[PDB]
Design a protein around this ligand. Structure first.
Ligand SMILES: CCCCCCCCCCCCCCCCCC(=O)OC[C@H](COP(=O)([O-])OCC(O)COP(=O)([O-])OC[C@@H](COC(=O)CCCCCCCCCCCCCCCCC)OC(=O)CCCCCCCCCCCCCCCCC)OC(=O)CCCCCCCCCCCCCCCCC
Ligand SMILES: CCCCCCCCCCCCCCCCCC(=O)OC[C@H](COP(=O)([O-])OCC[N+](C)(C)C)OC(=O)CCCCCCCCCCCCCCCCC
Ligand SMILES: CCCCCCCCCCCCCCCCCC(=O)OC[C@H](COP(=O)([O-])OCC[N+](C)(C)C)OC(=O)CCCCCCCCCCCCCCCCC
Ligand SMILES: CCCCCCCCCCCCCCCCCC(=O)OC[C@H](COP(=O)([O-])OCC[N+](C)(C)C)OC(=O)CCCCCCCCCCCCCCCCC
Ligand SMILES: CCCCCCCCCCCCCCCCCC(=O)OC[C@H](COP(=O)(O)OCCN)OC(=O)CCCCCCCCCCCCCCCCC
Ligand SMILES: CCCCCCCCCCCCCCCCCC(=O)OC[C@H](COP(=O)(O)OCCN)OC(=O)CCCCCCCCCCCCCCCCC
Ligand SMILES: CCCCCCCCCCCCCCCCCC(=O)OC[C@H](COP(=O)(O)OCCN)OC(=O)CCCCCCCCCCCCCCCCC
Ligand SMILES: CCCCCCCCCCCCCCCCCC(=O)OC[C@H](COP(=O)(O)OCCN)OC(=O)CCCCCCCCCCCCCCCCC
Ligand SMILES: CCCCCCCCCCCCCCCCCC(=O)OC[C@H](COP(=O)(O)OCCN)OC(=O)CCCCCCCCCCCCCCCCC
Lengths: 96, 70, 98, 99, 318, 105, 80, 104, 169, 347
C-alpha cells in the first residue's frame, strides 16, 4: 500500500512542480519589474534627499564591476516603513 | 456497571474535540471560509505575498479571478 | 559588518575569559568551553545562512558532534579526577609541580 | 637548586603511583504502610547491589508471651489470633493442641 | 483572534488532564472488580474539581529547599513544555503549522528531563538527587529509541511535517507497514512519562521513596498535570503517527472525532497496562532498552532506510 | 607537510565544500557566486604573491559582496540624511515610501 | 550451522531477528528489480527550472515544445 | 510571531499556575511548624555518556528523510547503512566489554 | 523595535554568557548556558536555520547539557563578591557597547560593525519547494562521504575511549 | 589496555595526524586535531594513576582551548574570505588566533605551561608520542599558513620558547621534564626559521624527532625516569651510557654531531635575510640547553655514581625489552652531519 501510494504521491509532486515550472517565467518577469521599480524609486529619492551632502554621487555603485548585482534587502526596503520591512524580512520565518 | 466510566470519557472526549474543531472554525473564519494557506516553502510564501499584493486590500485570501482582467 | 557578529564574538570572548580564569571547579571550565563551542555554532550558522552557501549547512552539525564528543571526554576526565580526589576542584590537581 | 619557595617539594613516587587518599548505608522501610509498614532495614548498598541487610525489628513487640504468664489458658488463647493475624485459627489450633 | 485559538487549545488541555484523573480512577476501579469515584459528583463528575481545590490549598510540605530559583523553575518548565508539545499537532489543522513539527516535538520532549533534574537539585536530600538521576537516565535512555523509531517512520513520510503525516496515511494506517516500530514506540513512550510498568520513582525499586525521610517536593498538582498532559499528548501523537484517520477538508470534524476516539482508546490502553503488570526492576528496563529495543530499532532503521529504495517507494519531499 | 594525497590518488575528499562556486545540491547558487568565480578565475595559477596585487579589485568586490560594508555604510548615510531632513522639516516621504500605494504585481 | 541457528533462535530471538532484518536491509536492494526506479524517479523530479538551450541549428534530440515527441518521457512512471 | 505569542502564553499560564500553587495555600495562615559527598556510581555516568554518544550518532542520522531524495542513491544508501552499522558496532562494543552491566 | 529582534536576542545571549562565565556554581552555570543556548537558538531560527536551531534544542540542550547537569549532580555537592562584581562589569561593558553602537550607528571593538538591524543583509529571493539549509544537510550523505566516515569513526573511537578511561584498570 | 584496542587507538592517532596533513578544508583540519586529541587521551591514561589523570586533564584543557581558538580563526576566515581552503589566512586577526592556537597545540612559550607537567605525568612511551608525533600536525598547518603569519608574533613566540626552554631544564632532575623543556626550546628553533625557509623547519623537526625518539627509547630501555636512577646505568649496561652521552652531546648542538646541523642551517638561512642579532641570541641561549645536557652526561657517563647491592642480581639478566630502532636512531642522531645536503629532499 505504501509502494502504490508513494508512487502516486511522487507523480502528484511532479505535477505540482510542473505547474511551478509553467508559472515561473511570469513570476520572474514580475519579480524583475518589481525590483527595478523599487530601485528606481530609491534612486529618485536619493537624488531628492542627497543634495545638501557635499560630494555625493547619486547611484554610485559600490562594486567596481558594472555587472548587475542582486539587490540587497536594505537596498530595496531601506527607505520604506517598518511594517513592510518586517513583512518582507521575517514574514516567511514568522509565518505560523 | 462498566458504562459508568462513560460520562468521564465523554467529558474528556469533548475536551479533546474542542481544540481541533475550534482551530478549524477559526482558520475558516480568518481566511474567507477556506483553509489557512500553508506556506512551508519560500515559493508558497511568494505566491501568498503576491496574492496579498494583487488583492489590493492587504489580505491574501481575497481571491481575484478572471473578473480582475479585461 | 553585521551587528550580531560583534555580539557573538563578544560572547566567545566572555566565555574565553571565563575559561581563561578558573574560580574553583573544573565543571565551570567545561561549561565555559562548551559556551565557546555554542558561540562558534551560532556564528558559523549565521555566516552560512547569510551567504546561502548550501554545502556548509552540514558544517555546524559536524562542529556540534565533534565538540560534544570532546565534551564527553572532558566529563570522563572530570569523573576520574573527582573519583581520585573527592571533589572536582582544580587546586587538587597540583601534583605535577614536582 | 632549592630556594625558599621550592623547598617544601618532595620527590615523586618511583612508580609514579600515588596513594588513593566506602559505600552507601541506607536506612530503609516499606513504601506504603499497609502490608508490612512496621519494618526497618539498615542497608549497605554498593550502588545497585546489596552487601549487608540488617532488619531492625521489635517495632511491633507487644510483650505477648509475658502477658500470657499473668492470664489463664482461656484468656491467653486470644493472644494467638494476633500473632499471625492472617492465620488466626491456625495459631488457635496450635495453642489448642499444646494445651 | 489567534489568542482565542491559543486559549481553546490550552484550556481544554487542562480540563482533559483534570478528567483523565477521573477516567483513570474509574477504569482502574472497574478493572479491579470495584468502582472508582461515584459519591463526590453525579457518576463522579465532581471528583477532579474537588481534588484540585483540595490540592491547591494544601500546605507546602515540610522542608526548605537547596535552590529556591530552580524550585520555582522546575514546575514552570514542566508545564511550559507540556503545553508547547500540543501546538504542532495536526488535529487536522495544527495551531502552529511548522515544517519541522516532529523534530520540534522530539526536541521539546528531550528538554523535559530538566524539570526532573532541577527538582532533584532543589530538594535538600542527597537521596532524592540519586532518584532523580535514575529517572533522568531512564528518560534519556528511551529518548534514543524515540528518536530512531521516529526517524524510521518518517522515512515513509518524506518530511518532518506532522501535517503531511495525515496525507501519508490515506491509503493504509502506518501501523500496517511498521507495527514492530509501533509496538516498540508505544512501550518507549510508556517508559518516557514514567508510566507503569516503568514508574520507578512513583513506586518501589527506589532508594528514596521509603517511608518518612526528607526532600521537599514542589506542588504535586503541577507536576502531575504536566505528566498527564504528556500522556494525552503522546497518545495523540502515536494516534497521528500510526493510526491516522480520514481527513475530509470540507468536514474536518470527522477527522477530529475519529482521532479523538482513537486517542481516548490509546490513553485507556495506558490505563489498562498499568492495571495489569508488575513493575520492572531498574536494570531490567535498562536491559529492555539497550539489549532488546535498541538492536531491533537499529535493524528496522536499516530496513526502513533500504526499503523505499528496493520498492521504489521514496515519499515526496514536499 | 601538505601531502596532497587527494591529487595523487584522484579522490575528492574535501574539495567540494571548499568554495561557494562548487557543485551545489539542486543547483543552488550562493549570494556571491559570480564575485567568487571572478576572483578565483583571476587568481588561478598566478600564485598568492601575484594574487595579492593583480586580483585586488575582484577580491575587494567579493569581500564587499560578502560583508556589504560599503553598501550598509551608504544606506546609513542615506537614512541618516533622511532622518535629519525629517528633523529639519525640509523633507516629507513620498506615498510609495509610506505604504499607501498598492504594490506592483 | 543449523544446530547453532536453532540454539540462538531458542536463546536470543531478539538478536536473531535483529541480525536477520539488518542482513535483509544490506543485501536486498542489490537484488531488487525496483532499485533502478528509485534512481529514475529521483532524477526525474523537477526541482529547478528547465533552462532551455539556444537553438543553433543541429539539436534534433532537444524538443522545441513540451508536447513535441522527442525529449525525455515519463510514460514508465505513469505505467510502471 | 504567532509561535512567540503561543510560547509566551504557555509560559504565562505556567507561571500563573505556579503563582497560584505557591501563594493561594499561603492565604490560610497555618501553624508554625517548629518541631524538628553523595555516593558515586560509574554506571550512571556510563549510561549518560552512552546516551550522549548515541544521540550524536542520531544527530548524524536525522537528515535521512531528506537524504532519500538524492540522485546519488548508491552513496546515500551506503553511508546510511554505514552510520546505522557504526551505531550498532558502538552498541556491540558497549556490550562485550561489560559496559551494559547492572544497568543493562 | 521588532526589526532589531536578532540584535535583542544577541544582547540576551551576551548577558547570559556573562552570567554563567562569572561562575557562581556549575549548577547555575549550567542553567545560564541553557538559557543562553535557548536565545542563541532563537538567533539561528531568525535567519532561517530551523533544522539547526532544533539541533541546538535536541542535541546541545537535549543531550549534552543534560549530561553536564547529570554529572554536576553526581560529582558535586548540592550547591559571591567576585561573581557579582565580574557580572556587573561584563553587563556594564556590554551596555556601553550597546549605547555606543546605537548612538553612532557605527562602532569598532576589533572590527567595524553597522549599527542598524541585521535585516538589511538578507536576500531578496526564494528557494522554491525546498530549504537551502535542509538540502545542504541532506547532502551529508550524497556529497559528504569522507566527512561521514571520519565523523562516524570518531564517534566509534569515542565510545572505545570512554570505555577505556573510565574503567580504572 | 587490550592490544587490539591499543593498535586501533594508535591508528586513530596516526589517522588524525594524516587527516591534518592531507586535507584541503579547514573543517577537516579541525576534525583531525579533534581525532588526534580524542585518541591520544587513553594513551596518556594507560597506567591509571592520579598523575596520569591530572596530566590528561591539563592536556585536555589546553588542547581544547587551542581547538576552539582554531575554529574561531577558521570562522573569521570564512567571514573575511567566504571559503575554506587550507592556505594563507585572509585576516590578521584570524592569523593571530590561529598562530596562538597552533602555539598552544605545540606548547610553545608562553603557552608552554602544560608541557613538563603532562610529560612528567604520563609514561615514557606516551611522552614519546606527545613530544614527537604530536608536533607533526600543527607544524603542517604552520607550513600551510606562512604567507599570513605575523612575523613579530612568531619571532616573539620563538625566542620566548628558546629562552624559557633553556632556563626550564636547568633546575630539573626528572628526565621527562628535561625532555619537555628541550621540546619547548627546539620548537622555538623550528618556528624561528618558518617565515624564512620552512625546509629548514622540516629539517629541524626531523632531526629533533630522531634525537628525542633516541632519548626516550634509551630511557625505556633502561627504565630510568630520574637523573639519579639514570646514574646507575654504568653498572647495568655500560653501552647505554655511551649512547646517552653521544645523543645528549648531539642534542646540545655540538659539532661534529648531527644535532648541530638544524641550528646551523637555521643560522645559515636567517643571516641571509639580514638577521644577525636574532640567531646570535638563539645560539647563545642554546648554551643553557647544552648545560643541563652536560649535567646529565656528568651524572651518567663521564662519572660513576654509586650503585646499590641489588644491582648484582640484575647483572644476571638481559634486556628483554624491544629496543625498536635504537641502533638506527642512535646512528642517525649522531653521525648524519657528513650527509647534511640531504636536506634538499625536504624542498
Ligand atoms: C624506508 C624507510 C624504512 C623505515 C624503517 C622500517 C623498519 C622499522 C620499523 C618497523 C620495525 O621495527 O620493523 C622491524 C625492523 C627491525 O628493527 P629492530 O627490531 O629495531 O632491529 C633490531 C634487530 O635488527 C632485530 O633483529 P631480529 O633478530 O629480530 O631479526 C633480524 C631482522 C630480520 O629481518 C627480517 O626478518 C626481514 C624479512 C622480512 C622483510 C619484509 C617482508 C614482507 O633483520 C634486521 O632487523 C636487520 C636490520 C634491518 C634494518 C633496520 C633499519 C631499517 C631502515 C631505517 C631507515 C634507514 C635510513 C637511512 C638513511 C641514511 C641517510 C639519511 O625491520 C625489519 O625487521 C625488516 C627490515 C627491512 C628493511 C627494508 C629496507 C628498505 C625499505 C625501502
Ligand atoms: C501503537 C499502537 C499499539 C501498538 C501495540 C502495543 C500495545 C500492546 C502492549 C501490550 C502490553 C505491554 C506492556 C509493557 C510490556 C513491557 C515488556 C516488553 O515489551 O518486553 C519486550 C520483549 C523483551 O523480551 P523478553 O524480555 O521477553 O525476552 C527475554 C530477553 N532475553 C532473552 C534477552 C533475556 O520483546 C521485545 O523486546 C520485542 C520488541 C518488538 C519485536 C518486534 C519483532 C517483529 C518481528 C520481526 C521478524 C520476526 C521473524 C523472524 C525473521 C524474519 C525475516 C524475514
Ligand atoms: C485554580 C483552581 C480554582 C481556585 C482554587 C479553589 C477556589 C477557592 C480558593 C480560596 C479558598 C479560600 C481561601 C483559602 C483557604 C482558607 C481556609 C482557612 O483556613 O482560612 C483561615 C485563615 C486564617 O484564619 P484564622 O485567623 O482563624 O487562623 C487560624 C489559624 N491559626 C490559629 C493557626 C492562626 O483565613 C484567612 O487567612 C482568610 C484568607 C482569605 C479567604 C478568602 C477570601 C476571598 C478570596 C477570593
Ligand atoms: C569504510 C568506507 C565505506 C564507504 C566506501 C565508499 C562508499 C562510496 O560509495 O564511495 C563513493 C563516494 C561518492 O562517489 P560518487 O560516485 O558519488 O562521486 C561522484 C561525485 N559526486 C559526489 C559529486 C556525485 O565517495 C567517494 O568517491 C570519496 C569518498 C571515499 C574515498 C575513500 C575513503 C577511504 C577511507 C579509508 C579509511
Ligand atoms: C468542556 C466541558 C467541561 C464540563 C465540566 C463539568 C462536568 C460536569 C457537568 C455538571 C454535572 C452536574 C453537577 C452537579 C453539582 C452538584 C449539585 C448539588 O447537588 O448541589 C447541592 C448543594 C446543596 O444544595 P442544597 O440547597 O443545600 O440542598 C438541600 C435540598 N433540600 O448545592 C450547592 O452546592 C450549590 C450549587 C452548586 C452548583 C455546582 C454546579 C457544578 C459546577 C461544576 C463546575 C463545572 C461546570 C461546567 C462548566 C462548563 C459549562 C458551563
Ligand atoms: C583582563 C581580561 C578580563 C577583563 C574583565 C575583568 C572583569 C573583572 C575581574 C577582574 C579580576 C577579578 C578576580 O579576582 O578574578 C578571579 C576570579 C577567580 O577567583 P575566585 O576563585 O573567585 O576567588 C579568588 C579571588 N580573586 O575569576 C573570576 O571570577 C573569573 C570571571 C570571568 C568572567 C568574565 C566575564 C566578562 C568580563 C568582561 C569582558 C572580558
Ligand atoms: C529557565 C528559562 C525559562 C524556561 C521555560 C521557557 C522556555 C522553555 C519552553 C519554550 C521552548 C521554546 C522553543 C522555541 C523554538 C522551537 C523551534 C521553532 O521555532 O520551530 C518552529 C519554526 C520552524 O519551523 P518552519 O516551519 O521550518 O519555519 C517557519 C517557516 N514557515 O520556527 C519558527 O517559527 C521561528 C519563530 C521565530 C523564532 C522564535 C524562537 C524562540 C524565541 C527565542 C528563545 C526563547 C526560549 C529560550 C529558552 C529555551 C529553553 C532553553
Ligand atoms: C551482517 C548483518 C548486519 C550486522 C550488523 C547490524 C546488526 C543490527 C542489530 C544491532 C545489534 C547490536 C548488538 C549486537 C551485539 C552482539 C553480541 C552479543 O550480544 O553477544 C551476547 C549474546 C549472548 O547474550 P548474553 O551475553 O547471554 O546476554 C544476556 C542476555 N540474555 O550472544 C548472542 O546471542 C549471539 C549473537 C550473534 C548471533 C546472531 C545470529 C543471527 C543470525 C540470523 C540469520 C542470518 C542473518 C544474516 C547476517 C549474518 C549473521 C551471522
Ligand atoms: C615532515 C615529517 C613528516 C612525518 C615523517 C614521519 C614521522 C615519524 C614520527 C615517529 C613518531 C614515533 C612516536 C612514538 C612511537 C609510536 C609507537 C608507540 O607507541 O611506541 C611505544 C610502544 C609502547 O609499548 P609499551 O609496552 O607501552 O612500552 C613501555 C614498556 N612496557 O613501544 C615501546 O615502548 C617500544 C620501545 C621502543 C620504541 C621506539 C619507537 C621509535 C619510533 C620513531 C623512530 C624514529 C622516527 C622515524 C624516522 C624519522 C622520521 C622523521
Amino acid at each position: 500500500s505504501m509502494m502504490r501510494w508513494n508512487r502516486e504521491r511522487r507523480r502528484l509532486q511532479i505535477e505540482d512542480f510542473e505547474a511551478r515550472i509553467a508559472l515561473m517565467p511570469l513570476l520572474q518577469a514580475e519579480k524583475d519589474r518589481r525590483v527595478l521599480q523599487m530601485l528606481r524609486e530609491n534612486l529618485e529619492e536619493e537624488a531628492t534627499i542627497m543634495k545638501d551632502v557635499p560630494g555625493w554621487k547619486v547611484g554610485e555603485s559600490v562594486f567596481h564591476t558594472t555587472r548587475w548585482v542582486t539587490p540587497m534587502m536594505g537596498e530595496l526596503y531601506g527607505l520604506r516603513t517598518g511594517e513592510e520591512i518586517l513583512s518582507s524580512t521575517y514574514g516567511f520565518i514568522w509565518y505560523t | 456497571m462498566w458504562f459508568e466510566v462513560l460520562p468521564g470519557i465523554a467529558v474528556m472526549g469533548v475536551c479533546l474535540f474542542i481544540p481541533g474543531m475550534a482551530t478549524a472554525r477559526i482558520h475558516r473564519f480568518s481566511n474567507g471560509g477556506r483553509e489557512k494557506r500553508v506556506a512551508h516553502y519560500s515559493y508558497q510564501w511568494y505566491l501568498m505575498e503576491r496574492d496579498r499584493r494583487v488583492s489590493g486590500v492587504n489580505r491574501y485570501y481575497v481571491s481575484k479571478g478572471l473578473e480582475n482582467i479585461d | 559588518m553585521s551587528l550580531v557578529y560583534m555580539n557573538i564574538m563578544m560572547a566567545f570572548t566572555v566565555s574565553l575569559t571565563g575559561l581563561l580564569m578558573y574560580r574553583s571547579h573544573l565543571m565551570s571550565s567545561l561549561l565555559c568551553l562548551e559556551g565557546m563551542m555554542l558561540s562558534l555554532f551560532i556564528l558559523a550558522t549565521l555566516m552560512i545562512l547569510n551567504s546561502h552557501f548550501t554545502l556548509a549547512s552540514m558544517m555546524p552539525i559536524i562542529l556540534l558532534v565533534f565538540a560534544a564528543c570532546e565534551a564527553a571526554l572532558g566529563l570522563s576526565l572530570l569523573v576520574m579526577v573527582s573519583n581520585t580526589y573527592g571533589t572536582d576542584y582544580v587546586q587538587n590537581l597540583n601534583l605535577l609541580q614536582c | 637548586y632549592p630556594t625558599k619557595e621550592t623547598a617544601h617539594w618532595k620527590p615523586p613516587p618511583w612508580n609514579d603511583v600515588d596513594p588513593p587518599k566506602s559505600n552507601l548505608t541506607l536506612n530503609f522501610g516499606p513504601q506504603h504502610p499497609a502490608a508490612h509498614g512496621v519494618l526497618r532495614l539498615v542497608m549497605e548498598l554498593s550502588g545497585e547491589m546489596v552487601r549487608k541487610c540488617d532488619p531492625h525489628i521489635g517495632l511491633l513487640h507487644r510483650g505477648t508471651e509475658k502477658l500470657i504468664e499473668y492470664k489463664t489458658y482461656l484468656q491467653a488463647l486470644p493472644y494467638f489470633d494476633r500473632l499471625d493475624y492472617v492465620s488466626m485459627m491456625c495459631n488457635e489450633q496450635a495453642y489448642s493442641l499444646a494445651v | 483572534m489567534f489568542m482565542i485559538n491559543v486559549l481553546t487549545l490550552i484550556i481544554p488541555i487542562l480540563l482533559a488532564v483534570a478528567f483523565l484523573t477521573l477516567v483513570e480512577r474509574k477504569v482502574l476501579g472497574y478493572m479491579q472488580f470495584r468502582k472508582g469515584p461515584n459519591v463526590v459528583g453525579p457518576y463522579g463528575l465532581l471528583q477532579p474539581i474537588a481534588d484540585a481545590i483540595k490540592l491547591f490549598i494544601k500546605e507546602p510540605l515540610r522542608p526548605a529547599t537547596s535552590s529556591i530559583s530552580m524550585f520555582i523553575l522546575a514546575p514552570i518548565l514542566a508545564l511550559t513544555l507540556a503545553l508547547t508539545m500540543w501546538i504542532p499537532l495536526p488535529m487536522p489543522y495544527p495551531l502552529i503549522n511548522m515544517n519541522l513539527g516532529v523534530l520540534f516535538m522530539l526536541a521539546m520532549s528531550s528538554l523535559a528531563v530538566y524539570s526532573i533534574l532541577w527538582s532533584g537539585w532543589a530538594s535538600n536530600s542527597k537521596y532524592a538527587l540519586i532518584g532523580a538521576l535514575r529517572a533522568v537516565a531512564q528518560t534519556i535512555s528511551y529518548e534514543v529509541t524515540l528518536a530512531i523509531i521516529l526517524l524510521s517512520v518518517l522515512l515513509m513520510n518524506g518530511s518532518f511535517t506532522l501535517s503531511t503525516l495525515i496525507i501519508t496515511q490515506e491509503q493504509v494506517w502506518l501501523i500496517f507497514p511498521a507495527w514492530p516500530l509501533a509496538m516498540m514506540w508505544f512501550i518507549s513512550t510508556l517508559a518516557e512519562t514514567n508510566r507503569a510498568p516503568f514508574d520507578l520513582t512513583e513506586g518501589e525499586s527506589e532508594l528514596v521513596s521509603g517511608f518518612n525521610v526528607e526532600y521537599a517536593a514542589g506542588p504535586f498538582a503541577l507536576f502531575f498535570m504536566a505528566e498527564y498532559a504528556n500522556i494525552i499528548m503522546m497518545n495523540i501523537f502515536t494516534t497521528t503517527l500510526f493510526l491516522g484517520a480520514f481527513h475530509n477538508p470540507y468536514m474536518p470534524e470527522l477527522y477530529t472525532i475519529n482521532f479523538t476516539i482513537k486517542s481516548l482508546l490509546l490513553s485507556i490502553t495506558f490505563l489498562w497496562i498499568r492495571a495489569s503488570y508488575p513493575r520492572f526492576r531498574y536494570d531490567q528496563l535498562m536491559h529492555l532498552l539497550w539489549k532488546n529495543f535498541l538492536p531491533l530499532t537499529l535493524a528496522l532503521c536499516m530496513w526502513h532506510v533500504s526499503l523505499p529504495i528496493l520498492l521504489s517507494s521514496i515519499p515526496p519531499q514536499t | 607537510p601538505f601531502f596532497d594525497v587527494q591529487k595523487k590518488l584522484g579522490v575528492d575528499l574535501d574539495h567540494w565544500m571548499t568554495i561557494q562556486s562548487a557543485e551545489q545540491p539542486h543547483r543552488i547558487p550562493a549570494r556571491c557566486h559570480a564575485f567568487e568565480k571572478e576572483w578565483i578565475e583571476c587568481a588561478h595559477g598566478i600564485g598568492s604573491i601575484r594574487a595579492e596585487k593583480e586580483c585586488k579589485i575582484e577580491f575587494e568586490d567579493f569581500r564587499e559582496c560578502l560583508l556589504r560594508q560599503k553598501t550598509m555604510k551608504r544606506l546609513n548615510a542615506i537614512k541618516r540624511q533622511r532622518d535629519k531632513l525629517i528633523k529639519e522639516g525640509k523633507y516629507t516621504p513620498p506615498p510609495h515610501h509610506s505604504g499607501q500605494e498598492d504594490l506592483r504585481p | 550451522v543449523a544446530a547453532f541457528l536453532k540454539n540462538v533462535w531458542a536463546k536470543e530471538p531478539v538478536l536473531v531477528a535483529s541480525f536477520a532484518i539488518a542482513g535483509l536491509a544490506v543485501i536486498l536492494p542489490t537484488l531488487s528489480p525496483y532499485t533502478k526506479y528509485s534512481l529514475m524517479i529521483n532524477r526525474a523530479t523537477p526541482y529547478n527550472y528547465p533552462v532551455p538551450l539556444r537553438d543553433d541549428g543541429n539539436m534534433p534530440d532537444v524538443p522545441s515544445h513540451p508536447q513535441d515527441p522527442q525529449g525525455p518521457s515519463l510514460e514508465w512512471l505513469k505505467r510502471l | 510571531m504567532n509561535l512567540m505569542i503561543t510560547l509566551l502564553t504557555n509560559f504565562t499560564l505556567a507561571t500563573l499556575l505556579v503563582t497560584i500553587a505557591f501563594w493561594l495555600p499561603q492565604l490560610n495562615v497555618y501553624s508554625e511548624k517548629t518541631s524538628p559527598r553523595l555516593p558515586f556510581s560509574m554506571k550512571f555516568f556510563l549510561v549518560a555518556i552512552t546516551f550522549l554518544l548515541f544521540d550524536l550518532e542520531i544527530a548524524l542520522l536525522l537528515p535521512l528523510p531528506w537524504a532519500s531524495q538524492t540522485t546519488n542513491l548508491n552513496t546515500m544508501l551506503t553511508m546510511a547503512l554505514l552510520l546505522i552499522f557504526l551505531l550498532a558496532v558502538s552498541l556491540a562494543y558497549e556490550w562485550t566489554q561489560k559496559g551494559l552491566e547492572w544497568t543493562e | 523595535m521588532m526589526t532589531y529582534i536578532v540584535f535583542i536576542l544577541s544582547i540576551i545571549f551576551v548577558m547570559g554568557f556573562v552570567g554563567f562565565s562569572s561562575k557562581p556554581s556549575p549548577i547555575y552555570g549550567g542553567l545560564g548556558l541553557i538559557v543562553s543556548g535557548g536565545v542563541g537558538c532563537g538567533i539561528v531560527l531568525n535567519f532561517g536555520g530551523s533544522f539547526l536551531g532544533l539541533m541546538v534544542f535536541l542535541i546541545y540542550l537535549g543531550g549534552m547539557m543534560v549530561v553536564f547537569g547529570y554529572t554536576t549532580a553526581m560529582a558535586t555537592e548540592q550547591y559571591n563578591k567576585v561573581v557579582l562584581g565580574t557580572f556587573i562589569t561584563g553587563l556594564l561593558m556590554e551596555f556601553l557597547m550597546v549605547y555606543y553602537v546605537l548612538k553612532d550607528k557605527e562602532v569598532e571593538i576589533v572590527f567595524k560593525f553597522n549599527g542598524m538591524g541585521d535585516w538589511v543583509i538578507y536576500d531578496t529571493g526564494d528557494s522554491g519547494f525546498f530549504s537551502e539549509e535542509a538540502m545542504g544537510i541532506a547532502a551529508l550523505y550524497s556529497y559528504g562521504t569522507w566527512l561521514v566516515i571520519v565523523t562516524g569513526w570518531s564517534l566509534l573511537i569515542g565510545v572505545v575511549v570512554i570505555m577505556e578511561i573510565t574503567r580504572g584498570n | 589496555m587490550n592490544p587490539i584496542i591499543l593498535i586501533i587507538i594508535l591508528m586513530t592517532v596516526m589517522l588524525g595526524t594524516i587527516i591534518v596533513m592531507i586535507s584541503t578544508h579547514w573543517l577537516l583540519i579541525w576534525i583531525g586535531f579533534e581525532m588526534n586529541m580524542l585518541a591520544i587521551i587513553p594513551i596518556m591514561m594507560k597506567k591509571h594513576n592520579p598523575r596520569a589523570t591530572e596530566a590528561s586533564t591539563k592536556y585536555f584543557l589546553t588542547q581544547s582551548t587551542a581547538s576552539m581558538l582554531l575554529m574561531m580563526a577558521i570562522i573569521i576566515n570564512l567571514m573575511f574570505s567566504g571559503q575554506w581552503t587550507v592556505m594563507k589566512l585572509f585576516n590578521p586577526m584570524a592569523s593571530m588566533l590561529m598562530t596562538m592556537a597552533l602555539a598552544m597545540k605545540l606548547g610553545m612559550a608562553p603557552f608552554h605551561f602544560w608541557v613538563p607537567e603532562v610529560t612528567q605525568g604520563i609514561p615514557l612511551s606516551s611522552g614519546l608520542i606527545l613530544l614527537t608525533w604530536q608536533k607533526l600536525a600543527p607544524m603542517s598547518v604552520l607550513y600551510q599558513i606562512l604567507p599570513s603569519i605575523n612575523l613579530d608574533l612568531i619571532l616573539t613566540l620563538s625566542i620566548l620558547s628558546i629562552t624559557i626552554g633553556g632556563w626550564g631544564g636547568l633546575n630539573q632532575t626528572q628526565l621527562r621534564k628535561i625532555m619537555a623543556y628541550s621540546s619547548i626550546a627546539h620548537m622555538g628553533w623550528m618556528t624561528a626559521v618558518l617565515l624564512y625557509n620552512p625546509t629548514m623547519t622540516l629539517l629541524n623537526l626531523i632531526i629533533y624527532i630522531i634525537m628525542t625518539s633516541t632519548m626516550f627509547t634509551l630511557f625505556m630501555a633502561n627504565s630510568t625516569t630520574t637523573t639519579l636512577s639514570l646514574s646507575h646505568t654504568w653498572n647495568k649496561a655500560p653501552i647505554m651510557t655511551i649512547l646517552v652521552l653521544i645523543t645528549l652531546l648531539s642534542m646540545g648542538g655540538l659539532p661534529p654531531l648531527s644535532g648541530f646541523m638544524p641550528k646551523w642551517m637555521i643560522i645559515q638561512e636567517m643571516t641571509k635575510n639580514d638577521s644577525i642579532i636574532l640567531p646570535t641570541l638563539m645560539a647563545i641561549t642554546a648554551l643553557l640547553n647544552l648545560y643541563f645536557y652536560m649535567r646529565l652526561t656528568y651524572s651518567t657517563a663521564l662519572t660513576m655514581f654509586p650503585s646499590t647491592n641489588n644491582m648484582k642480581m640484575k647483572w644476571q639478566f638481559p634486556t628483554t625489552k624491544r629496543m625498536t630502532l635504537l641502533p638506527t636512531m642512535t646512528v642517525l642522531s649522531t653521525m648524519l652531519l657528513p650527509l647534511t645536503p640531504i636536506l634538499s629532499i625536504l624542498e
